[PDB]
Paper text:
The type 3 secretion system (T3SS) of Shigella flexneri is an essential component of bacterial virulence. This belongs to a promiscuous subset of the effector chaperone class, chaperoning at least five effectors of unrelated sequence.
Spin-labeled Spa15 was crystallised, and its structure solved. Monoclinic crystals were grown and solved in the space group P21 using the Spa15 dimer model. The hexahistidine tag and first four N-terminal residues, as well as the loop encompassing residues 27–29, were seen to be disordered. The single spin-labeled cysteine residue at position 19 could be modeled as a single conformation with B-factors close to that of the main chain. Due to favourable energetics, the multi-methyl substituted pyrrol ring lies solely within a largely hydrophobic pocket, containing the residues Ile17, Ile35, Ile43, Ile23, Leu119, Leu14, and Leu37. The closest interactions lie from the MTSL C6 to CD1 of Ile17, and from the MTSL O to ND1 of His120. The distance between spin-labeled cysteines observable in the crystal structure, taking the measurement from the centremost point of the N–O bond, was 4.5 nm and corresponds exactly to that determined by DEER.
Numbering used by the authors:
A (entry chain B): 4 to 26, 29 to 133
B (entry chain A): 4 to 26, 30 to 133
């Protein structure tokens, strides 16, 4: 698939500004005010969305655990495993999802995917 | 992949008793005071999963930190390197899709089962 075209098409369809998009190969980024950017890229034949959050302190993670666990248990139907995945590295808590092939061919459908992913980002940002 | 042969052979190799396995499938490994380990070929990939009774909401709140730490734990044998936690009405389900490198060998696969069981033990301890 042509991911730049899919993404640009998704973003005018929902009336997003064009200035938020930055880009030959991986990856595409969408800037958001006071939020981590959404990264999009073809990763081994599948469209992948991810967001890097500054790793919370261990104490903040404990106090926010219940809320974060509820977020991670929420179904994400566009995902190959029907979940959003949370990955931890030394520096980041990374939200990650691999999108099903059925949803990467239509810019209108893909906009709803990006918007639901953003909503998940919003909830996580709220408790960090 | 002959999954029945892989599993039986994994369990001999670590001296488990043969009484604990039952069954094309899925195959169950019964363990005491705990959910069984279910194993099956699901679209060409070996999948392991364990069904835990959905905790009450208050219990989830008091165990959330321990359950979050468990899920953030690296699981190197997984395709996405995590153990996934799935919620259904009746169950909190631990799930992993095992990666090809680890499913041709009964000796290697026994270690995958053992690490998976360890993750089940940690979750059982806070539910
Ligand atoms: S218009 C900015 C925007 C982009 C996208 C990721 C699709 N969103 O959820 C909003 C609407 C915030
Ligand atoms: S011997 C019982 C057993 C089976 C398996 C799931 C492989 N295990 O981790 C133990 C050793 C508990």
């Amino acid at each position: 698939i042509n991911l730049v075209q899919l993404v640009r098409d998704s973003l005018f369809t929902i009336g997003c500004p064009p200035s938020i998009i930055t880009d030959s190969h991986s990856a595409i980024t969408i800037s958001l005010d006071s939020m981590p950017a959404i990264n999009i890229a073809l990763v081994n034949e599948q469209v992948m969305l991810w967001a890097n959050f500054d790793a919370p302190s261990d104490v903040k993670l404990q106090s926010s655990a219940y809320n974060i666990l509820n977020l991670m248990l929420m179904n994400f139907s566009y995902s190959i495993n029907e979940l959003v995945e949370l990955h931890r590295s030394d520096e980041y808590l990374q939200l990650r999802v691999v999108i099903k092939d059925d949803y990467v061919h239509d810019g209108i459908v893909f906009a709803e995917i990006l918007h639901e992913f953003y909503q998940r980002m919003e909830i996580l940002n709220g408790v960090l």
